[PDB]
Amino acid sequence: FRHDSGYEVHHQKLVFFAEDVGSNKGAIIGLMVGGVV
Amino acid sequence: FRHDSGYEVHHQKLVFFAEDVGSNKGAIIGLMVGGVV
Amino acid sequence: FRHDSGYEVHHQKLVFFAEDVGSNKGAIIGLMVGGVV
Amino acid sequence: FRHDSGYEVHHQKLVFFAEDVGSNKGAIIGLMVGGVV
Amino acid sequence: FRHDSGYEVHHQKLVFFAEDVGSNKGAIIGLMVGGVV
Amino acid sequence: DAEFRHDSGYEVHHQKLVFFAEDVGSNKGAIIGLMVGGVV
Amino acid sequence: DAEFRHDSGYEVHHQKLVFFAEDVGSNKGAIIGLMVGGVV
Amino acid sequence: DAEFRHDSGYEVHHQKLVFFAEDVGSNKGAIIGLMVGGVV
Amino acid sequence: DAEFRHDSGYEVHHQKLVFFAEDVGSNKGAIIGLMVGGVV
Amino acid sequence: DAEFRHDSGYEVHHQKLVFFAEDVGSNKGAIIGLMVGGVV
Numbered sequence: 001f002r003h004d005s006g007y008e009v010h011h012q013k014l015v016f017f018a019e020d021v022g023s024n025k026g027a028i029i030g031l032m033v034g035g036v037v
Numbered sequence: 038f039r040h041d042s043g044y045e046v047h048h049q050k051l052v053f054f055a056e057d058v059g060s061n062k063g064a065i066i067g068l069m070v071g072g073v074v
Numbered sequence: 075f076r077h078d079s080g081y082e083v084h085h086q087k088l089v090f091f092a093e094d095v096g097s098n099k100g101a102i103i104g105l106m107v108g109g110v111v
Numbered sequence: 112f113r114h115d116s117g118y119e120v121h122h123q124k125l126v127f128f129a130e131d132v133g134s135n136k137g138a139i140i141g142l143m144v145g146g147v148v
Numbered sequence: 149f150r151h152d153s154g155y156e157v158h159h160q161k162l163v164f165f166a167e168d169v170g171s172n173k174g175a176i177i178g179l180m181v182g183g184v185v
Numbered sequence: 186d187a188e189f190r191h192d193s194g195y196e197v198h199h200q201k202l203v204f205f206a207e208d209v210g211s212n213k214g215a216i217i218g219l220m221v222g223g224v225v
Numbered sequence: 226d227a228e229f230r231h232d233s234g235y236e237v238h239h240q241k242l243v244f245f246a247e248d249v250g251s252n253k254g255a256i257i258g259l260m261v262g263g264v265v
Numbered sequence: 266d267a268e269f270r271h272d273s274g275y276e277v278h279h280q281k282l283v284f285f286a287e288d289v290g291s292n293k294g295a296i297i298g299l300m301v302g303g304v305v
Numbered sequence: 306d307a308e309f310r311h312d313s314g315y316e317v318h319h320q321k322l323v324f325f326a327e328d329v330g331s332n333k334g335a336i337i338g339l340m341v342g343g344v345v
Numbered sequence: 346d347a348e349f350r351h352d353s354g355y356e357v358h359h360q361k362l363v364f365f366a367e368d369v370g371s372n373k374g375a376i377i378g379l380m381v382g383g384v385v
Contacts, residue, residue, distance in 0.1 A: 001038045008042045008079075012049045016071035016108070019056045027064045027074045027111075036055075036073045038075045045079045045116075053108035053145070054091045062099045064111045064148075069103075073092075073110045075112045082116045082153075085186070090145035090182070091128045099136045101148045101185075106140075110129075110147045112149045119153045122226070127182035128165045136173045138185045143177075147166075147184045159266070188228045196233045200240045204262030204302060210251040210291070213265045213305070223260040224246070228268045236273045240280045244302030244342060250291040250331070253305045253345070263300040264286070268308045276313045280320045284342030284382060290331040290371070293345045293385070303340040304326070308348045316353045320360045324382030330371040333385045343380040344366070 018036040027037050055073040064074050092110040101111050129147040138148050166184040175185050206224035215225055246264035255265055286304035295305055326344035335345055366384035375385055 003040045003042060005042045006044070008045045008047075010045070010047045013051070015052045017054045018071060018073040020073050021058045022062065022073075023060045025060065025062045025074065027066065029066045029069055029072070029074070031067070032069045032072055034071045035069050036057075040077045040079060042079045044081045046083045048085045050085075050087045052089045055108060055110040056093045057110050058095045059099065059110075060097045062097065062111065064101045064103065066103045066106055066109070066111070069106045069109055071108045072106050073094075077114045077116060079116045081118045083120045085122045087122075087124045089126045092145060092147040093130045094147050095132045096136065096147075097134045099134065099148065101138045101140065103140045103143055103146070103148070106143045106146055108145045109143050110131075114151045114153060116153045118155045120157045122159045124159075124161045126163045129182060129184040130167045131184050132169045133173065133184075134171045136171065136185065138175045138177065140177045140180055140183070140185070143180045143183055145182045146180050147168075186226045186228075190230045190232075192232045193236070194234045196236045197240065198238045200237055200242075202242045202262075204244045204246075206246045206262065206264040208248045208264055210248050210253070212251050213248075213253045213255075215255045215257065215265045215305075217257045217260045219259045220263070221261045223263045224248075225265045226266045226268075230270045230272075232272045233276070234274045236276045237280065238278045240277055240282075242282045244284045244286075246286045246302065246304040248288045248304055250288050250293070252291050253288075253293045253295075255295045255297065255305045255345075257297045257300045259299045260303070261301045263303045264288075265305045266306045266308075270310045270312075272312045273316070274314045276316045277320065278318045280317055280322075282322045282342075284324045284326075286326045286342065286344040288328045288344055290328050290333070292331050293328075293333045293335075295335045295337065295345045295385075297337045297340045299339045300343070301341045303343045304328075305345045306346045306348075310350045310352075312352045313356070314354045316356045317360065318358045320357055320362075322362045322382075324364045324366075326366045326382065326384040328368045328384055330368050330373070332371050333368075333373045333375075335375045335377065335385045337377045337380045339379045340383070341381045343383045344368075345385045
């Protein structure tokens with residue numbers, strides 16, 4: 001009985017919370033997985 | 038009985054909290070996974 | 075019975091909290107995983 | 112019974128708290144995992 | 149029964165707290181894991 | 186790792202409550218929104 | 226690692242409560258929003 | 266590592282409460298928002 | 306390492322409370338927001 | 346290392362409270378926001 005697995009990445013938990021009450025703000029990003037702008 | 042796994046990264050917990058009451062702010066990022074701008 | 079795993083990184087807990095009441099601030103970042111700007 | 116693991120990094124706990132009431136501040140960073148700017 | 153692990157870094161606890169009431173401050177960093185600027 | 190959390194607003198491992206109410210008296214008048222184990 | 230947290234607003238390992246109420250008296254009048262184990 | 270935290274607003278390992286209330290008297294009048302184990 | 310923290314606002318390993326209330330008297334009048342183990 | 350912290354606002358290893366209240370007297374009038382083990 002061998003698992004025999006060269007790379008294991010069992011879990012990850014990522015929580016992003018962004019809140020903006022912001023006004024009159026302009027910004028170019030190319031990519032935002034989670035962005036508030 | 039052998040697990041036999043060359044790389045193991047069992048867990049990670051990442052929590053990002055961003056709050057902005059900010060106004061009149063402009064900024065270019067190329068990438069923000071979690072950004073408030 | 076052998077686990078036999080060359081690299082082990084069992085856990086990590088990262089908590090980032092950013093709050094900005096800030097106004098009239100402009101800044102270029104290329105990447106912010108968690109940013110408030 | 113042998114664990115047999117060449118590198119072990121069992122845990123880490125990182126907590127970053129940034130609060131800014133700051134205004135009229137502009138700064139270029141290239142990367143901020145946790146930044147307030 | 150042998151653990152047999154060449155490098156062990158069992159734990160670390162890092163807490164960073166940054167608060168800025170600061171205004172009219174501009175600064176370039178390239179990287180801030182935790183920065184307030 | 187194993188993390189066990191128990192939250193109880195109120196927990197009792199063991200409890201005994203005894204309430205005894207005797208009324209010997211005619212003509213009491215009362216208004217009660219909620220009476221538990223209550224004698225007028 | 227194993228982390229155990231118990232939170233209880235109120236915990237009792239063991240409790241005994243005894244309430245005895247005797248009324249010997251005619252003509253009392255009362256208004257009670259909530260009466261538990263209560264004698265008028 | 267193993268971390269154990271117990272938080273209890275109120276904890277009792279053991280408690281005994283005895284409340285005895287006797288009324289010998291006619292014509293008392295009362296208003297009580299909450300009466301527990303209470304005799305008018 | 307093992308870290309044990311107990312926080313209790315109020316802890317009692319053992320407690321005995323005895324409250325005795327006797328009223329011998331007609332015509333008392335009272336307003337009580339909360340009466341526990343209370344005799345008018 | 347092992348670190349043990351107990352915090353209790355109030356701790357009692359053992360306590361006995363006895364309250365005795367006798368009223369022999371007609372016509373007392375009172376207003377009490379909270380009466381515990383109290384005789385009017």
